[PDB]
Amino acid sequence: QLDAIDEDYSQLRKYSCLGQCTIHAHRRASIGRRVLEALDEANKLIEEGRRFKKFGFKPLPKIVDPLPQIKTFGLETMLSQLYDLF
Amino acid sequence: QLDAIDEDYSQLRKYSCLGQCTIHAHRRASIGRRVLEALDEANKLIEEGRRFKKFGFKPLPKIVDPLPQIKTFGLETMLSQLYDLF
């Protein structure tokens, strides 16, 4: 969510007309820490991101494999019988 | 002549209205060096000034010691004679 610090720095850019005024110099510390945290976090994510070589794995086969489901008629009774013996 | 740097710093204080403005920031170096030079020079003069114990010395006796010069009359001729034999 770098957009949040982007808008925050834009809001500071609205009021930081002068470096000398303290009316707004207090929030410079917040920007100074949050920008650095975002920067080194992004660097860590970049270094990790470049390093992956495998991006997927074959999942375990499903409990049941789907089969053609052509519309049936009047099979409910014998299906129930098959379940009964099963 | 500390008055010179005094007036110079007053002239800078006329423009010292804004820290942010840098047009006048160039002369800050000149003030920064001249004030320090005056300060440590003054400190050296103070340390030397406190240390004197003797403040005068008896001069060598003059070639001639003045004597009463009461107004004289008609002594020029014999004064010239005295100079002649002297």
Automatic annotation (TrEMBL), chains A, B:
Highest rank taxon of the organism: Eukaryota
Membership in a protein family: Belongs to the disease resistance NB-LRR family.
Protein name: Uncharacterized protein
Species this chain originates from: Triticum aestivum (Wheat)
